[PDB]
Design a protein around this motif. Structure first.
Motif, short mmCIF file in Angstrom:
data_model
loop_
_atom_site.label_atom_id
_atom_site.label_comp_id
_atom_site.label_asym_id
_atom_site.label_seq_id
_atom_site.Cartn_x
_atom_site.Cartn_y
_atom_site.Cartn_z
N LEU A 192 -4.21 7.41 6.92
CA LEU A 192 -3.21 9.03 6.49
C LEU A 192 -2.68 9.96 8.06
O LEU A 192 -2.09 10.11 7.79
N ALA B 85 -7.69 3.05 16.47
CA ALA B 85 -9.30 3.31 15.32
C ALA B 85 -8.75 2.44 14.02
O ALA B 85 -10.23 2.09 14.14
N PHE C 76 -10.21 20.03 18.78
CA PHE C 76 -11.47 19.80 20.00
C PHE C 76 -10.56 20.39 21.13
O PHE C 76 -10.04 19.67 22.11
N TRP D 47 -0.45 12.32 10.33
CA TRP D 47 -0.45 13.76 11.15
C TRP D 47 -0.54 14.16 12.34
O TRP D 47 0.49 14.95 12.91
N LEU E 288 -10.77 24.23 14.56
CA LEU E 288 -9.45 24.64 14.40
C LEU E 288 -9.71 25.73 15.64
O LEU E 288 -10.90 26.36 15.97
C1 LIG Z 1 -12.96 7.61 14.69
C2 LIG Z 1 -11.23 8.24 15.10
C3 LIG Z 1 -10.72 8.78 16.24
C4 LIG Z 1 -10.89 10.92 15.58
C5 LIG Z 1 -9.87 11.15 16.18
C6 LIG Z 1 -9.44 12.35 14.82
C7 LIG Z 1 -11.04 13.00 14.20
C8 LIG Z 1 -10.83 13.36 13.05
C9 LIG Z 1 -11.88 14.02 12.39
C10 LIG Z 1 -10.90 14.26 10.67
C11 LIG Z 1 -11.32 15.51 10.87
C12 LIG Z 1 -9.84 15.99 10.43
C13 LIG Z 1 -9.13 16.91 8.89
C14 LIG Z 1 -10.33 18.19 8.70
C15 LIG Z 1 -8.88 18.58 9.99
C16 LIG Z 1 -8.29 20.12 9.26
C17 LIG Z 1 -8.62 20.57 8.63
C18 LIG Z 1 -8.12 22.62 7.73
O1 LIG Z 1 -8.55 23.06 7.76
O2 LIG Z 1 -6.94 22.02 8.17
C19 LIG Z 1 -6.11 23.46 9.01
C20 LIG Z 1 -4.66 23.21 8.25
C21 LIG Z 1 -4.85 24.75 8.51
O3 LIG Z 1 -5.59 26.16 8.08
P1 LIG Z 1 -4.98 27.24 8.70
O4 LIG Z 1 -4.75 27.50 9.87
O5 LIG Z 1 -6.83 27.43 9.42
O6 LIG Z 1 -4.64 28.45 7.96
C22 LIG Z 1 -5.57 28.26 6.38
C23 LIG Z 1 -4.51 28.75 5.44
N1 LIG Z 1 -4.98 28.59 3.73
O7 LIG Z 1 -4.66 23.22 7.31
C24 LIG Z 1 -3.77 22.36 6.56
O8 LIG Z 1 -2.87 22.12 7.27
C25 LIG Z 1 -4.52 21.01 6.03
C26 LIG Z 1 -4.55 20.21 6.64
C27 LIG Z 1 -4.54 18.58 5.96
C28 LIG Z 1 -5.82 17.18 6.22
C29 LIG Z 1 -5.18 16.40 5.80
C30 LIG Z 1 -6.08 15.16 7.24
C31 LIG Z 1 -6.21 13.91 5.74
C32 LIG Z 1 -7.57 13.02 5.95
C33 LIG Z 1 -7.99 13.82 5.81
C34 LIG Z 1 -10.17 13.20 5.83
C35 LIG Z 1 -10.28 12.20 7.42
C36 LIG Z 1 -11.24 12.48 8.00
C37 LIG Z 1 -10.60 10.98 8.48
C38 LIG Z 1 -12.32 10.11 9.36
C39 LIG Z 1 -11.93 9.09 10.03
C40 LIG Z 1 -11.86 9.12 11.13
C41 LIG Z 1 -10.60 9.57 11.89
#
Ligand SMILES: CCCCCCCCCCCCCCCCCC(=O)OC[C@H](COP(=O)(O)OCCN)OC(=O)CCCCCCCCCCCCCCCCC
Ligand SMILES: CCCCCCCCCCCCCCCCCC(=O)OC[C@H](COP(=O)([O-])OCC(O)COP(=O)([O-])OC[C@@H](COC(=O)CCCCCCCCCCCCCCCCC)OC(=O)CCCCCCCCCCCCCCCCC)OC(=O)CCCCCCCCCCCCCCCCC
Ligand SMILES: CCCCCCCCCCC(CCCCCCCCCC)(CO[C@H]1O[C@@H](CO)[C@H](O[C@@H]2O[C@@H](CO)[C@H](O)[C@@H](O)[C@@H]2O)[C@@H](O)[C@@H]1O)CO[C@H]1O[C@@H](CO)[C@H](O[C@@H]2O[C@@H](CO)[C@H](O)[C@@H](O)[C@@H]2O)[C@@H](O)[C@H]1O
Ligand SMILES: CCCCCCCCCCCCCCCCCC(=O)OC[C@H](COP(=O)(O)OCCN)OC(=O)CCCCCCCCCCCCCCCCC
Ligand SMILES: CCCCCCCCCCCCCCCCCC(=O)OC[C@H](COP(=O)(O)OCCN)OC(=O)CCCCCCCCCCCCCCCCC
Ligand SMILES: CCCCCCCCCCCCCCCCCC(=O)OC[C@H](COP(=O)(O)OCCN)OC(=O)CCCCCCCCCCCCCCCCC
Ligand SMILES: CCCCCCCCCCCCCCCCCC(=O)OC[C@H](COP(=O)(O)OCCN)OC(=O)CCCCCCCCCCCCCCCCC
Ligand SMILES: CCCCCCCCCCCCCCCCCC(=O)OC[C@H](COP(=O)(O)OCCN)OC(=O)CCCCCCCCCCCCCCCCC
Lengths: 55, 486, 90, 64
Positions: free
Chosen positions: B126, B143, B60, B130, B68
């Motif tokens: 989760l 949330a 964001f 982070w 990203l």
């Molecule tokens: C409703 C509440 C308010 C919501 C506010 C927050 C909104 C969150 C929305 C969910 C989206 C966040 C998760 C996806 C984003 C991360 C995706 C990603 O690509 O991570 C990039 C990171 C580094 O990638 P990069 O720098 O591009 O280089 C790659 C080199 N191999 O690669 C990494 O380091 C790995 C990242 C791992 C992330 C793990 C997260 C665990 C949870 C995943 C599911 C989240 C969905 C949650 C839905 C409920 C909403 C809270």
């Protein structure tokens, strides 16, 4: 004087098989790494450890 | 285009599994089990030799709102881990299928709703570990509460309504003053961040004010004695997965938040106030564990047990010691293992069968269910502080760290080993022994899925109990980080 | 003249599933007892016994453990000790 | 990026059309062409907001 036996059950129940198989597999893998480290200077799963350099 | 095509494929596969299978619960189990595989592959690539935040990503941002962002100017929401975060994420992610397992046959009426809410709560907690801003920690910190309100209200006991209210009310009311303190930080520093914030120094009269607003919120969420009040009723009238995710993960989330948010930039405050924390910690160990003895209900006892163990946990955090910090982490992770198993024993094997949680009905469970009574005793003894279980490693290093900082508070803090055994074995011998109860008609033995959950949650205590060094590779930075001994 | 419309055809709501037979004879005395114990706070009133326990556990015990905690902050190290060495800082 | 803003604003449009189908007690894919209609409309709002932010950054660069 009789023992008055209950019905026959098999030895290798599924739980005995699962728990013994997983534990003997982990111990055998640990000995495999301790043997592989003496040959090559590092453990086998350390080849899969690829973190980024701190710099 | 690639990462968008993945989502356009996976949502399509989701819609098709919906159209052909009425439940989703298979796909939810599959997704959370894949999250396990993903986080352990992140653990393989994790560098332990760096104090750094290894896997960073911004959401964001201005220049890229959807996705990203690689820019020289950042105002979005930061995310990333050290060892200290990652431990809890491990304890988080192996819990998430189990609660999705834990109600596989109980919920009949509206399946897809309940499993969606349970998985959504698990995903939010989760992403709680982070986060890297103060605001992005706090957005996801709260949330959970609409999902918890909707989960406790629709499903539960006859008293679903009051319990869903209290989990909104007390948790909200503490979190608002937490927000006050976050705002006061964000207008002085003009930067919410988990990276830089040990560098900035505030005035002692200004640290003196900020720290109260965060600490009373941690008093609400790790329930210390003034507000330890919602905890037994929000357990005792919860459904199963809500109670498991609550007492395994939310309390440890506030145990994490006292490390991540307070101990870096409130140090010179924190020394002036460790006796107030020791007042409240000893006074919530003694007086909640003593109120356990007079209880008619059965899930409520394990609730007050969780209060007593978190009261032990937080006096290792504020102990200003290497031992206390490591003991609080191993207590938090081991209690997150052992305690949802106890909420399974009261809630899954014993409320699904008889639907009444009053203690007075239950007697002599051994002679019709031997292996359940086997569980009830070996999970009883794992709760007390009987060693080789990881609960004692947490209790022991926490009591030792609390004995460093003030010895007389550790002297009366040490009697918790007695007080935690009294009510737990007083419950255990009433359930285990006696002639089988005239009220209870005989029912089924513990099924394969319940024994599966139990075996996992007991092995995972025993491995930490036999060797607590298995996760020292994550924490040896973050045990030295929060110490202030000039 | 204002009634909700004719094209509703609303039906009854079941909760669905299997009629699990009663594994428990509920006791009227135990249920009344436990309902009285869980909802005790709506009939709680202040008396002299309540005043005694509320004085001693909410006021007197925090003040006593408070005085003991603030007096004993930097008194004791026992870390490396010897005969003839005082352990109190003061 | 310009493209991810388009795809995500079109995703917001797909969400509005989905939720508007499902208040009506319709199925999800009841009228499939309205997904395209709403997605292009909310994507156009994404176009507008992205261009306004471009121009605002370019004004901030000219003050040096
Ligand atoms: C409703 C509440 C308010 C919501 C506010 C927050 C909104 C969150 C929305 C969910 C989206 C966040 C998760 C996806 C984003 C991360 C995706 C990603 O690509 O991570 C990039 C990171 C580094 O990638 P990069 O720098 O591009 O280089 C790659 C080199 N191999 O690669 C990494 O380091 C790995 C990242 C791992 C992330 C793990 C997260 C665990 C949870 C995943 C599911 C989240 C969905 C949650 C839905 C409920 C909403 C809270
Ligand atoms: C050494 C290394 C070993 C490590 C441990 C290996 C675990 C093995 C798991 C397994 O086998 O699969 C079963 C398991 C599921 O269990 P299940 O058998 O299917 O149960 C379903 C039915 O109930 C099962 O069927 P059922 O219906 O019949 O259920 C009956 C139930 C019984 O009902 C009960 O009442 C159970 C009672 C409670 C038991 C539960 C606790 C388990 C006890 C542990 C044993 C400790 C022994 C004491 C210490 C000894 C030390 C070794 O069954 C049992 O539980 C019996 C268990 C005991 C069987 C043991 C038999 C082994 C014999 C060995 C013989 C040795 C041969 C030597 C020959 C030498 C020749 C050279 O599946 C899994 O694989 C789970 C994965 C767990 C892996 C270990 C966890 C690792 C990760 C932990 C987390 C990491 C740390 C935390 C990190 C925190 C974040 C930082
Ligand atoms: C030192 C002494 C100080 C004086 C205080 C004692 C105090 C305040 C305690 C509150 C503590 C605040 C907690 C805050 C913590 C501090 C930070 C407790 O007063 C209570 O004392 C109890 C025991 O003595 C009584 O309980 C039960 O009683 C029997 C029922 O069957 C059972 O026999 C017994 O077994 C129960 O126990 C109560 O009835 C009484 O209200 C007030 O006492 C005084 O106030 C009034 C108002 O009520 C009392 O009421 C009167 O009684 C009516 C006929 O009764 C009359 O018609 C009416 O004229 C008037 O209303 C007086 O009597 C007086 O005494
Ligand atoms: C109250 C409840 C509130 C719920 C809140 C949930 C918030 C969800 C917002 C999701 C926005 C965060 C998206 C995570 C980013 C993951 C990702 O990278 O997706 C790919 C694409 C951008 O990828 P890119 O910027 O090019 O970086 C890749 C470098 N390797 O990213 C995209 O193209 C965006 C695709 C997602 C669009 C979803 C729009 C909302 C859906 C409804
Ligand atoms: C982010 C949005 C995208 C989420 C995608 C999740 C995919 C799973 C969605 C799903 O399948 O929902 C299930 C259910 C569908 O209904 P149905 O399938 O017919 O149920 C039949 C049961 N046999 O869905 C429903 O029926 C839901 C019914 C409405 C629920 C009303 C109460 C929910 C209140 C939610 C509070 C939201 C507050 C947000 C605040 C922030 C929280 C993060
Ligand atoms: C090192 C760590 C040690 C970990 C111990 C692992 C042991 C796992 C196996 C325990 C199984 C014990 C058992 O199965 O006992 C069953 C017993 C059945 O009762 P029974 O005498 O057969 O009469 C039946 C009437 N219908 O059920 C009972 O009556 C209850 C008595 C259970 C006895 C448990 C023995 C082990 C307890 C170890 C405590 C560990 C605490 C941590
Ligand atoms: C000849 C005239 C008749 C044929 C018309 C032909 C016109 C050609 C263009 C058709 C439109 C296709 C492009 C838009 C995609 C919409 C596809 C669709 O129908 O909706 C997708 C899905 C429901 O689709 P469906 O598989 O039919 O399920 C219905 C019962 N569950 O519903 C959803 O998934 C909506 C969820 C959107 C949320 C996405 C958020 C993340 C981005
Ligand atoms: C405001 C939020 C709106 C979000 C819209 C996101 C669109 C969801 C896309 C997922 C999907 O594929 O939906 C397809 C599915 C098909 O519709 P369907 O009901 O099955 O039609 C049957 C006709 N007989 O439809 C569904 O499966 C229902 C999807 C509805 C999702 C609502 C979620 C309910 C609340 C869950 C808690 C919130 C989760 C996020 C928390 C963070």
């Amino acid at each position: 004087h009789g023992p008055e036996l209950t019905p026959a059950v098999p030895f290798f129940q599924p739980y005995v098989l699962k728990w013994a198989g997983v534990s003997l597999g982990l111990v055998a893998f640990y000995q495999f790494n301790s043997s592989y480290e003496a040959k090559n200077g590092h453990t086998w799963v350390e080849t899969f450890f690829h973190p980024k350099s701190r710099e | 285009m690639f990462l968008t095509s993945i989502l356009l494929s996976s949502l399509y596969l989701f819609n098709r599994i919906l159209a052909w299978q009425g439940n989703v619960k298979h796909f939810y189990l599959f997704a959370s089990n894949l999250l396990l595989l993903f986080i352990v592959v992140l653990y393989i690539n994790f560098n332990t030799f760096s104090n750094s935040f290894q896997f960073n990503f911004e959401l964001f941002n201005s220049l890229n709102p959807f996705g990203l962002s690689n820019s020289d100017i950042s105002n979005g929401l930061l995310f990333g881990i050290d060892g200290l975060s990652l431990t809890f994420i491990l304890l988080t992610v192996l819990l998430i299928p189990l609660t999705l397992l834990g109600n596989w046959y109980n919920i009949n009426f509206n399946s897809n709703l309940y499993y969606t809410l349970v998985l959504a709560i698990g995903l939010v907690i989760l992403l709680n570990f982070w986060a890297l801003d103060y605001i992005s920690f706090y957005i996801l910190f709260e949330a959970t509460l609409p999902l918890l309100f909707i989960l406790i209200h629709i499903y539960g006991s006859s008293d679903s309504e009051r319990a869903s209210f209290y989990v909104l009310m007390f948790t909200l009311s503490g979190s608002l003053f937490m927000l006050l303190s976050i705002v006061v930080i964000s207008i002085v520093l003009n930067t919410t961040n988990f990276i830089n914030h040990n560098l900035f120094v505030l005035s002692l009269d200004l640290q003196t004010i900020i720290w109260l607003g965060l600490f009373i919120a941690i008093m609400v969420k790790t329930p210390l004695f003034p507000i330890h009040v919602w905890l037994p009723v929000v357990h005792s009238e919860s459904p199963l997965a809500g109670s498991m995710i609550l007492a395994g993960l939310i309390l440890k989330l506030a145990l994490y938040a006292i490390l991540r948010l307070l101990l870096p930039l409130l140090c010179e405050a924190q020394i002036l106030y460790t006796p107030m924390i020791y007042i409240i910690s000893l006074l919530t160990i003694i007086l909640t564990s003593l109120a356990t003895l007079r209880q008619i209900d059965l899930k409520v006892i394990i609730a007050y047990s969780s209060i007593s163990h978190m009261g032990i946990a937080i006096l290792g955090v504020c102990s200003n010691t290497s031992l206390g910090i490591y003991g609080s982490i191993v207590l938090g992770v081991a209690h997150g293992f052992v305690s949802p198993a106890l909420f399974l024993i009261v809630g899954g094997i014993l409320y699904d069968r008889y639907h009444i949680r009053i203690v007075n009905y239950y007697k002599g469970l051994t002679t019709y269910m031997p292996q359940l009574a086997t569980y009830i005793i070996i999970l009883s003894f794992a709760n007390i502080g009987t060693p080789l279980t990881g609960n004692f490693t947490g209790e022991f290093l926490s009591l030792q760290g609390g004995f460093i900082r003030n010895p007389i508070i550790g002297g009366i803090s040490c009697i918790s080993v007695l007080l935690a055994a009294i009510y737990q074995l007083k419950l255990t011998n009433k359930l285990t022994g006696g002639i089988s109860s005239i009220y209870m008609h005989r029912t089924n033995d513990v099924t394969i899925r319940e024994k599966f959950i139990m075996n996992i949650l007991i092995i995972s205590t025993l491995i930490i109990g036999i060797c607590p060094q298995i996760m020292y590779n994550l924490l040896y930075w973050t045990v030295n980080n929060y110490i202030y001994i000039i | 003249e204002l009634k909700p419309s004719s094209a509703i055809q609303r039906g009854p709501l079941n909760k669905g599933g299997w009629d699990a037979p009663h594994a428990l004879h509920n006791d009227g005395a135990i249920d009344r007892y436990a309902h009285w114990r869980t909802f005790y706070q709506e009939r709680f009133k202040y008396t002299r016994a309540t005043g005694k326990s509320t004085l001693i556990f909410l006021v007197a015990f925090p003040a006593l453990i408070g005085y003991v905690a603030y007096q004993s902050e930097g008194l004791f190290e026992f870390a490396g000790k010897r005969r003839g060495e005082s352990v109190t800082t003061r | 990026a310009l493209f991810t803003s388009l795809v995500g604003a079109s995703g917001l449009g797909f969400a509005t059309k989905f939720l508007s189908n499902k208040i009506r007690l319709k199925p999800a894919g009841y009228y499939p062409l309205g997904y395209v209609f709403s997605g292009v409309a909310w994507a156009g709002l994404g176009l507008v907001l992205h261009n306004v932010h471009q121009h605002s950054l370019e004004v901030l660069e000219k003050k040096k």
